[PDB]
Amino acid sequence: LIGYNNQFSGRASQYVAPGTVSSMFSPAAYLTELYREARNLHASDSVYYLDTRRPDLK
Amino acid sequence: LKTQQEQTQSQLAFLQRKFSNQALYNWLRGRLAAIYFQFYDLAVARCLM
Amino acid sequence: LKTQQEQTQSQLAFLQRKFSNQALYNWLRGRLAAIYFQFYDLAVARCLMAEQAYRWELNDDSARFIKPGAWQGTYAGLLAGETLMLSLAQMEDAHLK
Amino acid sequence: SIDVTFTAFAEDGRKLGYESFSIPVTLKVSTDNALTLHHNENGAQYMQWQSYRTRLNTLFARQLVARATTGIDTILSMETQNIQEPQLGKGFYATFVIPPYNLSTHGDERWFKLYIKHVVDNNSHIIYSGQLTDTNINITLFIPLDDVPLNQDYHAKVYMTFKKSPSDGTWWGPHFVRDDKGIVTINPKSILTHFESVNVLNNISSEPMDFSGANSLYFWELFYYTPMLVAQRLLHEQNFDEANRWLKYVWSPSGYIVHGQIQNYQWNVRPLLEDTSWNSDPLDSVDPDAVAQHDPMHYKVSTFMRTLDLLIARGDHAYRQLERDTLNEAKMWYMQALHLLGDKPYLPLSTTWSDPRLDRAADITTQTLTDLFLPQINEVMMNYWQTLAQRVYNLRHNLSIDGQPLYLPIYATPADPKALLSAAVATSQGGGKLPESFMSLWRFPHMLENARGMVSQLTQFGSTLQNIIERQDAEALNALLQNQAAELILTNLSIQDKTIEELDAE
Amino acid sequence: IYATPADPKALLSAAVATSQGGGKLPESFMSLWRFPHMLENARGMVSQL
Amino acid sequence: ANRWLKYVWSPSGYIVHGQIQNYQWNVRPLLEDTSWNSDPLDSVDPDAVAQHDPMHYKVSTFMRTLDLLIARGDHAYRQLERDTLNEAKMWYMQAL
Amino acid sequence: QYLLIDNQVSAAIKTTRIAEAIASIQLYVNRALENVEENANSGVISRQFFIDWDKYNKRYSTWAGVSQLVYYPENYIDPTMRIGQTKMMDALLQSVSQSQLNADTVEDAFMSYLTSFEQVANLKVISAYHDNINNDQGLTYFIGLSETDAGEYYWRSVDHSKFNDGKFAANAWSEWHKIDCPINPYKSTIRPVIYKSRLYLLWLEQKEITKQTGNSKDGYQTETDYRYELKLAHIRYDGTWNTPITFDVNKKISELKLEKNRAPGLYCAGYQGEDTLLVMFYNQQDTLDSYKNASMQGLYIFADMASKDMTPEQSNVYRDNSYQQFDTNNVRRVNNRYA
Amino acid sequence: QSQLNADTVEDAFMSYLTSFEQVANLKVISAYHDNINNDQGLTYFIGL
Amino acid sequence: FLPFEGIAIDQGTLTLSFPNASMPEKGKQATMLKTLNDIILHIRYTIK
């Protein structure tokens, strides 16, 4: 077909503005990723378990 | 004569194993040639400027 | 024939006693090769500095002209210089345009 | 565990009693199934670790050499990319057609995923993922089978999920069973609710060149990157017509003619012709080329952009001539770029956000949205409309490329015929590679010295090359001469043997 | 408070230039000299090489 | 640079043949003699003084480790992002 | 350093709740990666997210940069500036670069591209080793063999981080590299291993050593004291290989009840750290359950290339945890790291 | 002469030690002190 | 390159610092600053 709106279109349903929390590139998105990865670096019974050090972070 | 045969073969081994062998020159030519040509296009462009 | 044995040994002796013997070339190589490599790293670093200047003047930080393959261990660095000379010519052209 | 006893004694030896603790120690060793290597009867080699089978080799490298031998068009044809490879292992091919996007089904979101079950486990694995379009999606997947089925009604199950009712119920999606003699059928108890159609491709034991296999990297360089590179370089040299021709090896907006027959496709790279749906799951990488390739749609888009860049460059080239006739040419080229972009898409922005707790936000995938965060617009692509809009505006308002006013005459001053001739002559004198010489800021004596230094550097490379050549030839000769000495020696050895036989005869 | 996102095109040039040739390209320190000065110094350094 | 310093000194110890060792210093003459001397070599050569009394190398080794941690710190510091400043901080805290 | 927040800063510094969270965590991770915190979970550390920590994921600025690069690669990708350009492409470009760029120039370059390709297009893959704990993370290293010359060993690696919807993203695979070591394995018992973060490979060879006289007085010997040399070699940083170190494993092999024509199964895996290589020999069975309670003869190899017999007290543990990596008749399996 | 890494230094150590071995155990034949007190100055040695 | 050359005209912050400004501590700029009417920057920038 002819046009960007006919080919390639229809990818990311809704979009967000570049400064919102909801953006996948926002600091919140970064926080979410760091958290899901860091969350399990230490054993749940360890003094350095992330939730032991910071019970509020979650 | 057998000795001469062996001596001839050791000379080939030398020619093939020495650093400055045909592989070296084949490589140097191929690489330099690419450079020379590319350099040329640039040299021309400045001459044209 | 005995005299030809003597003559051959005399020629071998010469090869082992003349100043420009193999020891000389192995020595000259060991030192020049050490210099050439070190000099190369310095040459690259400056080419890279020229490149930073290129980038700071033309506000474009994606530019890279200096290619990491200039020094091949195989073939002992031969043509590393010529390789860099081209990259600089290219950088210079990019600037002029 | 470690058994720790706390005990003590009195000064007079009396025990003061005790307390005992036990510190557990757990040895945790993760285990999983090993990756398995296989070599099949048909010569295919592959790696398997789940239900996934990855091809390790290719068996037609010779055909490719034979095709390159007859020219660029033979090697880069579509036919080349249809050289087939054997199937990897017990299994079959089936075509799945996913219907057009609707809201009565597939509401709100456009993603869907296809999963396979009961093949190596009773669990599921994703075999395809993508997004629903205004039309259907027609794909073919290889469905692997194990030696012994985990289900006696069917040997494999395939089902679709898509946010709305992603139920994985019994009989939702086709159930496949292997009959004897290699025949695969769909168990009639199953329901194709989420498929437009399913077709078991009986008698197909092969597939076209695998751009996802271990040697696929070479096909990507051969069929996609090389022609894009060549066009890139030609464009830098301002050879706009050749860059155009070269882009056509990847994409022809007007289609192709093959063997006279008018063909029905525009993308000439098989994996770009295929994959007409965005992958709904992005590749979790840091390498943009691994992302592309994994999802070929990205190359389709970069190809699209390069085509526009070329149209734009041709327009810009004309614009800068500042002759009213060339300004009209520029307009024409920009109008084509606009035709090609089509309408600027409307991209509404959402204000919906649930303010979730970080722990809840940490929504992962392994083996009111389905994710939490949303993408941005992609200003680089949007800028193509903005760019053309501005360039066209300037033409409509009689402005220069940077918006400056200009007062060109209605009719152009005639070109100086002497200069037209020298240009024509130089072009036809030889070479022809006499590109725009850009008139820059530097005055003649500066540029003369610069050109001069550039040339003396060239004369040095020249003499250097001359020495290499003379040496390359000198060495070729020394080797020849030794091989020749060796041959004469062998002949002399035969002569000496006969000489000895003669003495024995004496 | 939050850093300006790095420009992805630059990250790519570096990544390509990190794995290509092993990435043996040392830090190019920001200097006081302008391009034509440094260009000439580099050129002299290369011709010596 | 770190890996190489570990051939001489590795605070936290070494694993040898899978076993946990109780030494911190991997150079026999630095591991031995933890007593700074009392009657120093009379010389003009600092290299002869060290060696003679190995404690001086133990200290210069210690300094190099600190110099390394600092350099990592400074590197991050100079990137001037809030994130890299916090990184610099941890490197300095480790040196402390 | 415990609460992951600096309580000695002046009031002058401002932040946001999110910005501090993205700091307390960044410190948490850095202390774990630098082993300040001595017992982190290695099955987590080994994940790609952390592998990229020092280039992209430790800073918002680079994280955000990459995320944009990967989300919309079409705005950044380039046929020249790309990752995964092969040696064959370099050769293509070099000959293309020697003359004017046109179709004929590239036709000849494509031909040499393809003839270089053909040579490794169908190497037999012999074995492979996964360098992670987690099968979907890290890389698998493969060793193959020319389909032409009896020798010629080559290797590949595949990055599993580029594996997603059942398939690898093409440049996930490295090109074949040639091993210049004159390897002559017995029954192809060759395994790659990542050891000391280097590519090592080890294999068995039989040394046919015997007497020239059948009874040491008048006669001849028939077969041989087929001694088993376990050889270990590694790649140098310049791509060449060094001379292998030979270890004596004859007592382990004579103990395994192998037939005349059966090489012992060879298990090799790096211990997750400590530069210790775990090698076990076994009599290959038809099924994996047959290794339950099956005796094995192993050894430890250390960075200091000394070795120790692996007492059955320990080989029994490694077996319970490492079987299902063991080859069985008619299949081959990839070993992974032991942790 | 090349990139600094572990392999470069291993090769270097091998030649280092080779040269060392050649003089590692010479027989000392005799020696001479160059001062009049044995706590100062130098002692010169001849080996073989 | 000149001081501050290459900085975007719309990004970041400038600071001008006068040491020894505090009057209670008898600084040197302290008496002069009471007579400083303004601060003027002269910014030479280019558009490309």
The three-state DSSP-derived secondary structure of chain G is CCCCCCCCCCCCCCCCHHHHHHHHHHHHHHHHHCCCCCCCCHHHHCCHHHHCHHHHHCCHHHHHHHHHHHHCHHHCCCCCCCCCCCHHHHHHHHHHCCCCCCHHHHHHHHHHHHHHHHHHHCCEEEEEEECCCCCCCCEEEEEEECCCCCCCEEEEEEEHHHECCCCECCCCECCCEEECCCCCCHHHCEEEEEECCEEEEEEEEEEEECCCCCCCCCCCCCCCEEEEEEEEEEECCCCCECCCEEEECHHHHHHCCCCCCCCCEEEEEEECCCCCEEEEEECCCCCHHHHCCCCCEEEEECCCCCEEEECHHHHHHHHHHHCCCCCCCCCEECECCEC
Q: Report the neighbours of B using a cutoff of 3 or more CB pairs below 8 angstroms.
A: C, D, G
Report the alpha-carbon distance of residue D400 to residue G175 in Å, rounded.
Answer: 51
Nearest to F56 by CA among F34, F80, F78: F34
CB–CB of D75/D249 below 8 Å?
no
Nearest to D43 by CA among D9, D95, D87: D87
Query: DSSP secondary structure string, D72-120?
Result: HHHHTSTGGGG-EEE--SSEEEEEEEEPPP-SSSS-S--EEEEEEESSS
Report the alpha-carbon distance of residue G170 to residue D210 in Å, rounded.
Answer: 10
Are residues A28 and D349, on separate chains, in Cβ contact within 8 Å?
no
E1 has a chain F CB within 8 A of its CB: yes
Q: Report the neighbours of G using a cutoff of 3 or more CB pairs below 8 angstroms.
A: A, B, D, E, F, H
Give the nearest partner residue to D476 out of B11, B22, B47, using CB atoms.
Answer: B22
Q: Tokens for D380, please give them.
A: 């680089």
CB–CB of H32/H44 below 8 Å?
yes
Q: How many helices (H) and strands (E) does chain I have?
A: 1, 0
Q: Tokens for G221, please give them.
A: 């010997």
D104 CB-contact burial (10 Å; exposed 0-12 / middle 13-18 / buried 19+): exposed
Cβ within 8 Å of residue G165, ≥6 positions away: D126, D127, D128, D129, D279, D281, D294
Q: Which chain C residues contact residue I6 at CB under 8 A?
A: 56-57, 59
Report the alpha-carbon distance of residue E23 to residue E14 in Å, rounded.
Answer: 9
Among C26, C71, C93, the strongest candidate for a mutation testing the B interface, having the largest count of B CBs within 10 A, is C93
CB–CB of G58/F87 below 8 Å?
yes
Beta bridge partners of D161: D113
Report the alpha-carbon distance of residue G154 to residue G87 in Å, rounded.
Answer: 15
CA dihedral H32, H33, H36, H40 (to 10 degrees): -170
Q: Compute how many other C-beta atoms are within 10 angstroms of the C-beta atom of residue G36.
A: 16
Determine phi and psi for D89, rounding to 5 degrees: -170, -175
Helix (H, G, I), strand (E, B) or coil at D127: strand
- Name the resolution in angstroms: 3.4
Are residues D286 and E15, on separate chains, in Cβ contact within 8 Å?
yes
- Chain G contacts in chain F segment 45-84 (CB below 8 A): 81-84
Helix (H, G, I), strand (E, B) or coil at D279: coil
Q: Which chain E residues contact residue I1 at CB under 8 A?
A: 31-34
The H or E element that residue H30 is part of is: strand H28-33
Q: Tokens for D315, please give them.
A: 């327009």
Are residues C96 and D440, on separate chains, in Cβ contact within 8 Å?
yes
Please tell me the distance in Å from E2's CA to the nearest CA on chain F.
Answer: 7
Sign of dihedral through CA atoms D367, D277, D84, G84? negative
Beta bridge partners of G159: G139
D430 CB-contact burial (10 Å; exposed 0-12 / middle 13-18 / buried 19+): exposed
Give the chain E residue whose CA is nearest to the CA of D456: E47
Give the nearest partner residue to D72 out of G85, G103, G133, using CB atoms.
Answer: G103
Query: CA-based diameter of chain H, in Å?
Result: 51
Q: Which chain E residues contact residue D288 at CB under 8 A?
A: 12
Give the chain I residue whose CA is nearest to the CA of C60: I6
Q: Report the neighbours of C using a cutoff of 3 or more CB pairs below 8 angstroms.
A: B, D, E, H, I
CB–CB of D177/D184 below 8 Å?
yes
Q: Compute how many other C-beta atoms are within 10 angstroms of the C-beta atom of residue C66.
A: 23
Nearest to F80 by CA among F92, F88, F72: F88
Nearest to D184 by CA among D97, D90, D45: D90
Report the alpha-carbon distance of residue G117 to residue G110 in Å, rounded.
Answer: 10
CA dihedral D305, D311, D317, D323 (to 10 degrees): -140
Q: Tokens for D233, please give them.
A: 């370089």
Query: DSSP secondary structure string, C4-29?
Result: HHHHHHHHHHHHHHSSSSHHHHHHHH
Q: Tokens for A51, please give them.
A: 């939730």
Query: CA-based diameter of chain A, in Å?
Result: 61
H1 has a chain C CB within 8 A of its CB: yes
Contact pairs from chain E to chain F, CB under 8 Å: 5
Specify the DSSP class assigned to residue D171. Answer: T
Give the chain F residue whose CA is nearest to the CA of E4: F81
The H or E element that residue C47 is part of is: helix C22-57
Cβ within 8 Å of residue G87, ≥6 positions away: G175
Chains B and I touch (3+ CB pairs under 8 A): no
Q: Which chain B residues contact residue D470 at CB under 8 A?
A: none
- Chain G contacts in chain D segment 1-40 (CB below 8 A): 29-39
G275: alpha, beta or left? (left if phi > 0; alpha if psi -120 to 50)? left
Amino acid at G164: N
Beta bridge partners of G208: G226
β D137-144/D91-98 pair status = antiparallel
Report the alpha-carbon distance of residue D308 to residue D338 in Å, rounded.
Answer: 9
Q: Tokens for D122, please give them.
A: 């009773």
Chains E and C touch (3+ CB pairs under 8 A): yes
Amino acid at E38: M
Q: How many CA atoms lie within 13 A of C28 on its CB side?
A: 7
Query: CA-based diameter of chain E, in Å?
Result: 48
Q: Tokens for D174, please give them.
A: 């086709």
Q: Tokens for C35, please give them.
A: 């210099």
CB–CB of D252/D266 below 8 Å?
yes
Cβ within 8 Å of residue G41, ≥6 positions away: A40, A41, A42, A43
Are residues E8 and G82, on separate chains, in Cβ contact within 8 Å?
no
Please tell me the distance in Å from G67's CA to the nearest CA on chain A.
Answer: 7
CB–CB of G129/G156 below 8 Å?
no
Helix (H, G, I), strand (E, B) or coil at D38: strand
Q: Compute how many other C-beta atoms are within 10 angstroms of the C-beta atom of residue G215.
A: 9
Please tell me the distance in Å from C53's CA to the nearest CA on chain E.
Answer: 5
Report the alpha-carbon distance of residue A3 to residue A12 in Å, rounded.
Answer: 17
Report the alpha-carbon distance of residue A14 to residue G118 in Å, rounded.
Answer: 47
Strand ordering across the sheet containing D36-39: D53-55, D45-48, D36-39, G332-333
The H or E element that residue D46 is part of is: strand D45-48
Q: Which chain E residues contact residue D287 at CB under 8 A?
A: 15
The H or E element that residue D472 is part of is: helix D444-505
CB–CB of C56/C50 below 8 Å?
no
Q: Which residue numbers of C have CB closer than 8 Å to H's CBs?
A: 30, 33-34, 37, 73
Report the alpha-carbon distance of residue D451 to residue D459 in Å, rounded.
Answer: 12
The owner of tokens 């027609």 is: D138
Q: How many helices (H) and strands (E) does chain E have?
A: 2, 0
G161 CB-contact burial (10 Å; exposed 0-12 / middle 13-18 / buried 19+): buried
The H or E element that residue D22 is part of is: strand D15-23
